[PDB]
Swiss-Prot record:
Role description: Acts as an epigenetic regulator of myogenesis in cooperation with DPF3a (isoform 2 of DPF3/BAF45C). Associates with the BAF complex via its interaction with DPF3a and HDGFL2-DPF3a activate myogenic genes by increasing chromatin accessibility through recruitment of SMARCA4/BRG1/BAF190A (ATPase subunit of the BAF complex) to myogenic gene promoters. Promotes the repair of DNA double-strand breaks (DSBs) through the homologous recombination pathway by facilitating the recruitment of the DNA endonuclease RBBP8 to the DSBs.
Location in or out of the cell: Nucleus; Cytoplasm
Tissue specificity note: Widely expressed. High expression is found in heart, skeletal muscle, ovary and testis. Overexpression is frequently observed in hepatocellular carcinoma samples.
Organism superkingdom: Eukaryota
The protein's name in its UniProt record: Hepatoma-derived growth factor-related protein 2
The protein's assembly and partners: Interacts with HDGF. Interacts with trimethylated 'Lys-36' of histone H3 (H3K36me3). Interacts with trimethylated 'Lys-79' of histone H3 (H3K79me3), but has higher affinity for H3K36me3. Interacts with IWS1. Interacts with H2AX, POGZ, RBBP8 and CBX1. Interacts with histones H3K9me3, H3K27me3 and H3K36me2. Interacts with DPF3a (isoform 2 of DPF3/BAF45C). Interacts with SMARCA4/BRG1/BAF190A, SMARCC1/BAF155 and SMARCD1/BAF60A in a DPF3a-dependent manner.
Similarity field: Belongs to the HDGF family.
Source organism (scientific name): Homo sapiens
PWWP domain mapped to chain residues: 7-64
Length: 93
């Protein structure tokens, strides 16, 4: 059975106005700003942006890739597809 989301989990993450986006659950570094309650720090592949999202907006990548893992015109998206398939756990800092 599924567990709760944990750092390193791969997802498509949904934000208003944007297609379901390749992303990971990030760790919070020592001394870094923590997310709000019930929110997770989401790192978006390709754009390398971070937002805080709850589980309703998080789709596990393995289950969802056949539907959401297709090229998209939006800035950074196809880069993001490469990253989530080929080096999803790298430092993109």
């Amino acid at each position: 059975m599924p567990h709760a989301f944990k750092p390193g989990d791969l997802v498509f993450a949904k934000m208003k106005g944007y297609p379901h986006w390749p992303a990971r659950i990030d760790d919070i570094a020592d001394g870094a700003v923590k997310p709000p309650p019930n929110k997770y720090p989401i790192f978006f592949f390709g754009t390398h942006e971070t937002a805080f999202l709850g589980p309703k907006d998080l789709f596990p990548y393995d289950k969802s890739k056949d539907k959401y893992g297709k090229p998209n015109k939006r800035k950074g998206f196809n880069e993001g597809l490469w990253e989530i398939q080929n080096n999803p756990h790298a430092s993109y800092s």
